[PDB]
Amino acid sequence: FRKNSDQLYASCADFKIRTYSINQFSQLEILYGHHDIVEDISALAMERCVTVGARDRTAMLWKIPDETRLTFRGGDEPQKLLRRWMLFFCEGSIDVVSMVDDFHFITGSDNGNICLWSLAKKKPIFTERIAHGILPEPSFNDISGETDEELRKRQLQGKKLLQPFWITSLYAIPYSNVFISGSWSGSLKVWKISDNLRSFELLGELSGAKGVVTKIQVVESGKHGKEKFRILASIAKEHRLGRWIANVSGARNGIYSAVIDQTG
């Protein structure tokens, strides 16, 4: 929903974005340009919505009044990243997005990369690789049927089979320097954007959640000077789009809650 208004933006699997006027119960426009399913969408007070194209790996910000669109692409390659260092997993798909500002937004990839973006720059301005860590390595007693333990260990191929967590959820409080990321790692991570808006750091973590964090929301109350924030995140045993993710031990279906207070 466009903030403080009745326009609704709907992203559909037919590679299109549809726009709606709830007060009028009618369709306004159909928006074209994504090459693959438009998995997530975000909106702020202005009409500048942003969307993410999943395997297309392109975050697009759309100017509805101007009928123009801006294309943003990561362009990150584990080759060059290793050489400048002299485990990095190539970006596979982008699945979450939330607009920190009308001039900034963040996106989460399936390789565990949380990237900060600016409208001026097409490439990312800052990136955080493997934000949620690496998935557990498969058990050796289950990888193969060979009796000898050394043979089964070889099938693990060391750390080559390891893969990173996916950023199932990502939400940023409007016009703030704090955003929350989620996965099935079993903990919610809260990040703080630097005041200069060219970097962000990990503010803290919340381990209460156990399961797939399908969506995250934040609600606040109290006086302007003293505010208490409540983080609500839907928790499920399976990913929202499909059942691909193997069962996570201890996962339960419920609504996670975390109340945080401000002091200084």
Binding site: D14, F15, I30, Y32, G33, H35
Partner: protein, 181 residues
């Protein structure tokens, strides 16, 4: 009076139209791509001849010559954009290696057939000319439309088409009405 509006013929008759091998070539091409007449093949041949002659002139020129660099880069860019030339053959030599079949394969009729929206090239042409196919947000009713690399993924049924979610055509609702009565 008003200044003239320029015009130019888009095709040219071949040198010896009655060559048996040429007749068989035209037959095969029309059969594959569902072309209406020999004028389309002549048109594509004329365009290809112009492109290849320009490429020849540029190749004759010395390397690192400003005209060669500029004009060859422009021609390679255009040929890559239209999709005839691939990203990894960006040289004038591969431009001289192009054939008519590549340009035919980029036609919107052939693309509609390949992508599966139609069961045959002729069915693709019939769908195109009946205003069922949209390249992005625009309805295209011209089989000779050349599809760019980016536009390739956006070929779909038009919203107004009965196949694209609109109401059924006149025949369908007519039959439904008479059945109801």
């Amino acid at each position: 009076p008003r200044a003239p509006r320029t015009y130019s013929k888009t095709y040219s008759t071949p040198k010896r139209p009655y060559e048996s091998s040429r007749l068989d070539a035209e037959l095969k091409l029309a059969g594959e791509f569902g072309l209406k007449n020999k004028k389309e093949i002549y048109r594509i041949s004329f365009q290809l001849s112009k492109i290849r002659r320009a490429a020849r002139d540029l190749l004759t020129r010395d390397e690192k010559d400003p005209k060669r660099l500029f004009e060859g880069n422009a021609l390679i860019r255009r040929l890559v954009r239209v999709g005839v030339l691939s990203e990894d053959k960006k040289k004038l030599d591969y431009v001289l290696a192009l054939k008519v079949e590549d340009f035919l394969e980029r036609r919107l009729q052939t693309q509609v057939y390949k992508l599966g929206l139609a069961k045959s090239v002729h069915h693709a042409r019939v769908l195109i000319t009946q205003r069922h196919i949209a390249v992005g947000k625009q309805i295209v009713n011209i089989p000779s439309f050349m599809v760019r690399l980016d536009s390739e993924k956006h070929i779909d049924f038009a919203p107004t088409s009965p196949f694209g979610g609109a109401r059924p055509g006149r025949v369908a609702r007519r039959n439904a009405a008479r059945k109801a009565e």
